[PDB]
Amino acid sequence: EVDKRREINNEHPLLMMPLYANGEEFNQGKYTFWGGDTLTGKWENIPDDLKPYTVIQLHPDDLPKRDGAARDFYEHMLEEAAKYVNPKTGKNEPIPVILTVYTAGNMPYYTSAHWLSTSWIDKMYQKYPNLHGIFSTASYWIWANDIENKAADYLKVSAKNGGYFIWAEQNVGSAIEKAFGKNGKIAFQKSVDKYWKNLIFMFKNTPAAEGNDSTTESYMKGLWLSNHTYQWGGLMDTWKWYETGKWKLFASGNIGKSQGDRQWLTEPESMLGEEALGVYLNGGVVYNFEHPAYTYGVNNKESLLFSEVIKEFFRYVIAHPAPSKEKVLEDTKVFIHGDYSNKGNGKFFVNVNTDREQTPLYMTGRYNVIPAIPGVLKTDKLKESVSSSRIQIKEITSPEFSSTQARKEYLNKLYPMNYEGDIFAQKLDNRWFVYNYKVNENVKQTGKLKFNSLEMNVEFEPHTYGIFERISNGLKVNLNNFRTNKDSLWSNAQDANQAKKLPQLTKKGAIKWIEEHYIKDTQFGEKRVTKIVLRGIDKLPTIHSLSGTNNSYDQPSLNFDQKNHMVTITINSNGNLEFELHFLEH
Ligand SMILES: CC(=O)N[C@@H]1[C@@H](O[C@@H]2O[C@H](CO)[C@H](O)[C@H](O[C@H]3O[C@H](CO)[C@H](O)[C@H](O)[C@H]3NC(C)=O)[C@H]2O[C@@H]2O[C@@H](C)[C@@H](O)[C@@H](O)[C@@H]2O)[C@H](O)[C@@H](CO)O[C@H]1O
Numbered sequence: 001e002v003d004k005r006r007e008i009n010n011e012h013p014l015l016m017m018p019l020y021a022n023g024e025e026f027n028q029g030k031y032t033f034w035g036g037d038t039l040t041g042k043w044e045n046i047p048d049d050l051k052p053y054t055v056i057q058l059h060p061d062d063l064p065k066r067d068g069a070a071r072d073f074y075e076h077m078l079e080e081a082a083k084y085v086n087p088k089t090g091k092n093e094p095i096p097v098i099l100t101v102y103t104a105g106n107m108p109y110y111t112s113a114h115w116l117s118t119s120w121i122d123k124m125y126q127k128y129p130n131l132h133g134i135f136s137t138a139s140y141w142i143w144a145n146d147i148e149n150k151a152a153d154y155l156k157v158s159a160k161n162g163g164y165f166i167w168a169e170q171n172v173g174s175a176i177e178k179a180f181g182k183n184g185k186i187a188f189q190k191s192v193d194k195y196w197k198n199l200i201f202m203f204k205n206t207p208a209a210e211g212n213d214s215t216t217e218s219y220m221k222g223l224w225l226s227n228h229t230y231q232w233g234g235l236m237d238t239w240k241w242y243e244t245g246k247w248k249l250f251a252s253g254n255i256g257k258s259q260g261d262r263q264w265l266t267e268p269e270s271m272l273g274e275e276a277l278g279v280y281l282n283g284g285v286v287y288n289f290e291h292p293a294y295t296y297g298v299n300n301k302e303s304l305l306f307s308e309v310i311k312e313f314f315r316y317v318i319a320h321p322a323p324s325k326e327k328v329l330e331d332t333k334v335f336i337h338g339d340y341s342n343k344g345n346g347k348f349f350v351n352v353n354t355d356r357e358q359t360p361l362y363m364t365g366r367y368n369v370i371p372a373i374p375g376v377l378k379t380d381k382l383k384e385s386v387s388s389s390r391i392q393i394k395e396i397t398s399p400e401f402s403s404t405q406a407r408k409e410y411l412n413k414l415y416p417m418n419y420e421g422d423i424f425a426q427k428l429d430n431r432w433f434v435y436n437y438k439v440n441e442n443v444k445q446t447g448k449l450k451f452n453s454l455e456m457n458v459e460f461e462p463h464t465y466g467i468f469e470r471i472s473n474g475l476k477v478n479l480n481n482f483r484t485n486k487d488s489l490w491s492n493a494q495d496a497n498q499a500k501k502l503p504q505l506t507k508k509g510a511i512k513w514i515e516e517h518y519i520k521d522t523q524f525g526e527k528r529v530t531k532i533v534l535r536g537i538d539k540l541p542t543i544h545s546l547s548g549t550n551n552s553y554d555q556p557s558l559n560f561d562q563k564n565h566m567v568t569i570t571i572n573s574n575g576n577l578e579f580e581l582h583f584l585e586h
Pocket of ligand 1: 034103
C-alpha cells in the first residue's frame with residue numbers, strides 16, 4: 001500500500017468542486033470553464049476552513065471529440081493548480097485536483113475523455129502530487145463493452161499512486177450489479193478485492209424518472225459496510241426536475257423533458273440539503289452536485305444555494321463527523337444480499353420508507369437506509385467484522401421481502417417506531433434530524449420527537465430541514481428552509497401545455513440568468529412559519545447565538561405557558577438559521 005495522497009472519511013469528508021471545460025472557447029484557443037469560474041479564482045474563493053476538505057474536479061464537458069484535446073486542457077490546468085502561489089503567505093500551495101477520466105462509456109461520439117489513456121493518467125499522478133484522484137461518472141445509460149475492465153485499470157492506477165478512484169453511478173439497467181460482476185464481467189470485482197481502500201463509490205441521482213434513488217443509495221451504503229469501497233457518497237443533481245418533467249413550483253401538470261434549462265434551476269435550494277442528509281445520516285462522506293452554475297455559482301462567486309445551504313451543511317458534517325463504519329454497523333439490524341433489478345428497483349422501498357417512485361427523499365427515518373450489496377458479491381468481509389454479529393443478513397428473495405406489506409412487517413419487528421407524525425425524522429445520539437418530505441406539493445407536516453422525557457413537536461412547510469440537539473443547558477437548533485422564488489422563469493405560461501412551448505432558455509441563457517437575476521437582484525421567497533413546541537420545561541427559555549441568512553428571518557417569538565410547563569416557538573424565515581435555547585426540564 002502506497003501512502004494515500006489525502007484522507008477521506010467521516011472526520012475528513014470531501015466536497016467536490018466541479019469545473020466544466022468550455023469546448024467552444026477551447027476551439028478559439030482559450031482555456032476556460034462554463035460559467036466563468038477560473039481554477040485559481042475558484043480555489044481562492046473557497047473559505048479557508050473548507051479548503052482542507054474540498055477538491056477541484058475538472059470535467060471535460062464539450063471539449064472537441066478527438067485525440068489530444070482533453071490532455072491539452074487538463075495538462076494546462078494541472079500546471080495552474082501546481083504552480084498556485086498563496087498571495088497572503090507568498091508560498092507555493094498546489095491546488096488539490098481530481099480529473100474526470102471516464103463518462104458516457106467514454107464513447108468517442110460522446111466525450112473527449114475517450115482519448116485519456118491509463119498510461120497518461122499514471123504519468124499525471126507521478127508528475128502532480130496535487131492530483132488526488134480520478135473520476136468516472138454517468139455511464140449507466142451507455143454501459144460500454146469494457147467498462148468493468150477499464151474501471152479495474154482506473155482503480156489499480158490510483159492505488160499504485162496512492163490516489164482515489166471515484167465512481168458515481170446509478171442503478172439504472174443494473175449498472176451497480178454489473179459493475180461488480182453480475183453478468184460475468186468480473187475484472188472490477190477482482191480489482192476491488194485488492195484495492196478497495198482506494199475506491200470511492202457514489203450515487204448519481206440524475207436519472208430521476210427511473211426511480212432508483214433508494215436502491216442505489218442502499219447499495220452505496222452496503223458496499224461501504226462490507227468493505228467493497230473505502231467510503232461512499234452521492235452526486236445530487238438539480239436536473240432531476242427536468243427528468244421528471246416538473247415546472248413551476250407546486251404547479252399542476254407535467255411538461256416532460258421540454259425545458260431543460262428552466263427546469264434545472266427550479267429545485268428548491270433547501271431540498272439539496274434534504275438529499276445530502278441521506279448521505280450524512282448513513283455514514284456517507286463524499287458530496288458533489290450538478291448543475292454546477294446553480295449548485296455552486298459562476299464567475300468565482302458562490303450561488304445562494306451554495307452559500308446558504310451546501311456550505312453550511314458541509315460545515316455541519318465537518319463539525320459533527322458522520323457516524324463511523326463501526327457505529328453504522330452496530331445499529332444495522334438488516335442487511336440485504338441480492339439484486340434490486342429483480343425486485344422492482346425503486347418500487348422495493350415505496351410505502352416502506354419512500355412516498356413515491358420518483359423522489360430523492362425519505363418519508364421515515366425508522367429503518368434509516370437499509371444497506372444492500374448485489375447478489376454477485378459475498379458477505380465474507382462483512383461477517384469478519386466484530387460489530388456485525390447481531391445483523392440479520394438476508395437474501396433479497398427471502399419471503400420477508402416478497403411484498404410491500406411483508407417488508408414493513410419484517411422491518412418493524414427489528415426497527416422500533418421511535419417518533420410520531422407523518423414527516424421524516426431520524427435520531428443520532430442526542431440529535432433529531434427532521435425534514436418535510438414533500439417534493440412538489442404544498443403540504444405542511446408535523447411530528448412529535450422526544451429527548452427522554454422532553455417532548456418536541458414541530459410543524460414544517462415543504463423544503464424545510466432541522467437539526468435539534470439536546471445539549472446540557474438546553475437545545476441547539478439548526479434550521480434551513482431557504483427557497484427563492486423561481487416563478488419568473490415560468491412567466492407567460494399559465495399551464496403545463498403552455499410551459500412546454502416557452503422559448504428555450506438554453507445553457508448560455510441560464511448561465512446569464514444566474515449572473516443577472518440570481519447572483520444579484522435575487523427574487524427571494526416569502527418568509528414562512530415554522531413551529532417548535534417544547535413540553536416539560538421549567539421556565540421561559542432564553543435564546544442565544546442567533547444567526548442566519550442576512551435579512552431572512554424575523555426575531556423568533558417564544559410563548560411560555562407556566563401552567564402546562566411548555567413553550568411555543570414561532571419562527572418566520574426563509575434561509576439558514578441557528579440558535580440555542582437555554583432551559584431546564586420541569
Ligand atoms: C442520463 C441522463 O439523465 N441524461 C443523459 C446526459 O447526462 C446528463 O443529463 C442531464 C439531463 O438530465 C444533462 O443533459 C447533463 O448535461 C448538461 O448539464 C451539464 C452540467 O450539469 C453540462 O452543462 C453539460 O454540457 C450539459 N449537457 C447538455 C447541454 O447536453 C448530463 O450530464 C453530463 O453528461 C454526463 C454523461 C456526465 O458526463 C455529467 O458529468 C455531465 O454533467 C448525457 O450527457 C446525454 C448525452 O447525450 O444523454 C442523456 O441521456
